[PDB]
């Protein structure tokens, strides 16, 4: 097996999509191995640019094809370069721009903490014919940066592992184990936009819904709380588009459901207060003194749900 | 006829679109056949990478073109590889990423059960010149997984069949029958998101519409039920985008139509109660005691429609 | 002139767009002509796959370039194939996927009947050098099918004609007449979705607008009819996106305009009833008995407009 | 300098975008020049198709690269063709599909009159080495047609000019003047859709806003005019998407601003009528008789603004 | 090191996206260096077009690959050209169309001032093997122009610097310093559209919210201010799409938050005025005379926030 020494340089991470859980990584990859010595013009290394690499692979040069496993589509490989040294070592440099995909988990949605993963692996040569020695990831252009809404926290974690493939067990009997490099970058979402845009107005609307009890009539109370029903209908539209159709519920939609429950509870309470008249004349003050009980109960429900 | 032994490895299924009934399958295809023996360097097999396969097909190697029938666009074939063995057998490995399309049926929409189909077929050689022996589908990366909102249920069903083509009956008189491989993966939708997002608030709004009868006036009742008309207008917008313009109706839109019918029935009932005054003085209590009759009738209508 | 015998096989029609009046046709094209005899390996026909056709056109083979006239962009030609027979005849098979465009007419919008047109024509050789003998269109995969919302009615109509081109009259003096094949498939829209989604709720809202006269006040009538003004404002949004900005009006927007006219007529009528008080005391009953006159007048207006 | 005689054939103009001020032109280009004589097979002209032109440019044929200046992206050149005549003249035919861009001016928006411009120019050879003799534009397929919403008015205006380039003044000292062809097609927008969709309902809503004065109360007037405030808020959404963020204002948004001013003027007038009570008892009839003054004043303001 | 003399000609800047902070630059690049002399046909310079450059790089010509660092995707290089002079100097001209990306800062959003940056750099040769002598940027086509909504202010600032790369420090020990050219163009946003579209109606709605105190009731005040709550909910939708989810807040959203605070303050004030009745009979005039205090306080809050 030949020892290849990868050195990825993340130039930028952008386009971080949460609907499809993809992101775009732009950067450089530098693989380096050693082979039989050769004679170059002079004793200085020879730089062979893009589309001149095919004039050398045709003549018998060995350049492996390192692919990215977790990519969506194919990478947009721009320039590429091959440095040939007289002492016998080859360096393959390339520029990649990929739409990578990782399994994201938005259980906590506004205060979410995710990681971006690049997986690199030879396409043809297993670990008996090509092994990765080491990786250095030079993530210095995004070291502590706000990319669009993510803080990139700390360094990048690098790992080299062996993967078993079973569809190649019928064509390669005992050597189908492929070397693989995994690079993980930890990112933390910036919750400020959702705090001042999706949580403060929901707080104001729910507080206004609490204040419907201070009217001294009935039909005016019903009409006002139905208007607030319509208003909290609007926020389902306003928050639908930012996230995927997840089977679980996040914090933002837990407040939406709590707002629906509060509106419906207030309407049902004033309806039952209208029907509490056993003789048609009895006034209700114990159930209408929920002006201190309903906000405290909502705070307790919100606290037990958030805890 | 030469016997080709396909072995598809589904790496992932994603991007499952219901508006256009397409999905994206990313994976590997491994075809294997046998030919005349040859001399390789040594006695070890020879790996010929991408764009070096054309230097061999030009010299006279026989590599068939296996296409995907149900694809939208063309597959984004990334790397490809050709293993040539000294004993005479050839193995063609390729990586495919396709936007496939199948005929989906959303009669039941939130509890829907669908299947994803890959169809593979030679482009040029009929079953007198190329036959498929067997297929093993290695769907172990999506075996029991929630891809975005689908459970993948169990194994993958594989089939090999013969297809008649009639536009080639004028150019190939008696041999136009093409071998074909069909792979079906059964997926079950996850109804949780529609349960807590599109059914619970419609239930609350329809219950609030039931509670309009407990007012003791007339014009307040009319204004309140028209506000609820507007609110259920909003949910047509809110549910329009998730599905294709189907000629039939699903469960979600059956509840939308039931909500429209309930609002209009309540408005028409209170209008007829206002016009039931034969002398201008007669009060109505039998038709205004539908506070127990309207929810039970709605439950019976919903139950007979759902059954 | 050489006689080419085209045989198109429509595999599917999908993506039928009405905003841009394009559609996507996926299928196969099989052209067949005869030339000088040749020696193949044995006496069996020779199949030359994709990218091996260029090794034959370089050596002097004659393969014409048949283009599609009404295409948007360029076709996504996938595989292609060339069958060379020892008796001297050549067969060029190709797989095409095109975004074609035809002049659609949505005068009647929900009950619309359109046709999908494929036009095929040589790029370089006029009818003195290349003539089309016949076409057989094998539309058996979409024969009577609901593609997304269109019934495909019956067979496909095929035509072969000659087209004059006048920009080539300065470079080809008397022979600029190009052969052309036109294929027309008749499709009929499925009006069910618009019936139960865009016409039933507009009917309910217009009926509720008719029922505003049964109030016995004035300001309540004005506020209610302005709420219904807002509701029919919403349907302009709800129906804007499904169709192109046409200079004429369809059935759906004729109902939108009729709803606007009904709301404004009711508001103007109750305003004039408020101002009919010549002494400030005279009550109006003849103009307020339009509870039977307004729905009948709306039905007559709708019937004369639809007829 | 060699004399090239271009002959553009506009096949269709479509996709006319106003947000980005681009449009798509599909058609053919035919350039023709004369060179040294040559021997062809026989004495008939030789047709060299796509990808066979490179076998001739490698051997020393001179084919200039005519580019389009005002294009967005690169043209999607489909087929191309080269006719070589024994008398010594060459004809280069190509099919182009370009997203062209022109500086549009929507000062008058619904009754707008624009022109579509194609600019063609050699890439390498200045007018000392390549001159354009003439252009004939064969715009007969779009001569008087409604493309999507534009009438194409009359013929196409053709011009041949010389352009100075100053970045090539440091590499070409005295000859950097490039020949150029400009083709202008005049199109007139079809205002019918905006008349019956964006102007008639704004007229109805503004008329209903005029009719708020005929109420005989105060708070009902305030609530009604605030509902109409909300309704004219909706039309900002409804008209935002059809046009670019222009620094000036068009006719449609001038009516939106006039509607906002009318609603606010009516609200401020009834507020000042409520506060005109110097003793708390004085009734106002001169300022409340604006039921004839407000519509006439709005008509005068609209007329002076439109004139 | 060889001295390359770049000369960029910005043809246009368009497509300026603020959601993703990218923009599209279309133009020409002209690099020029000197080498060993050569014999051309005659003594006139030799123009080698696109795809004929590969016939010269194969024979041993030295053409460096200048890449753009801050690009998204890869540039859409259209035509390219190579001028070879007998005195020994080479000129490489190319046409580029790139989606470039720069770090934008929308702290002030409507009156924003940004700059568009092009960064150009050799891919393979460091500054010991390739140095940039100078750059002239010919930005005369966008000199003082309104591109879509940006004024381009003045000339373009050009800079040539040296960049250290550390992933190449393991393969190039002491010479990994790459020459680089940065071009900055200063653009100023045109605030007119946001002034007459997003600030004038928010001013009108906030003024109408100030005018809720002039009612002489309580429940009518509450219902009116809740309607204005709904109206300012709509503008969060109306302004969400124009900008990225920034952690800070701009001017437009500061007015949105001020409108929410004003509505909630008015509602809470009238609620506390209803509960100021210590005996159930005491009328409030000092707290209800905020008709002059609330607008002045809002003006002071807006002024201290804007300053």
Residue numbers in the entry:
A (entry chain E), B (entry chain A), C (entry chain B), D (entry chain C), E (entry chain D): 11 to 317
Paper text:
Pentameric ligand-gated ion channels (pLGICs) mediate synaptic transmission and are sensitive to their lipid environment. We demonstrate that the model pLGIC, ELIC (Erwinia ligand-gated ion channel), is positively modulated by the anionic phospholipid, phosphatidylglycerol, from the outer leaflet of the membrane. To investigate the mechanism of positive modulation by POPG, we determined structures of WT ELIC by single particle cryo-electron microscopy (cryo-EM) in the absence and presence of agonist in MSP1E3D1 nanodiscs with 2:1:1 POPC:POPE:POPG (hereafter referred to as 2:1:1) or POPC. In combination with streamlined alchemical free energy perturbation calculations and functional measurements in asymmetric liposomes, the data support a mechanism by which an anionic phospholipid stabilizes the activated, open-channel state of a pLGIC by specific, state-dependent binding to this site.
We began with the previously reported gain-of-function triple mutant V261Y/G319F/I320F (ELIC3)33 that introduces three aromatic residues at the top of the M4 helix (M4). As previously reported, ELIC3 caused a left-shift in the agonist dose response curve, slowed desensitization in the presence of agonist, and slowed deactivation as assessed by excised patch-clamp recordings from 2:1:1 giant liposomes. The ELIC3 gain-of-function mutant further opens at 16′ with the F247 side chain turning away from the pore into an intersubunit space, but otherwise resembles the WT structure. The patch-clamp and Tl+ flux data of WT and ELIC3 show robust activation and desensitization in 2:1:1 membranes such that agonist-bound structures of WT and ELIC3 are expected to show desensitized conformations. Therefore, we cannot confidently assign the WT and ELIC3 agonist-bound structures as pre-active or desensitized conformations, and further work is necessary to clarify their annotation.
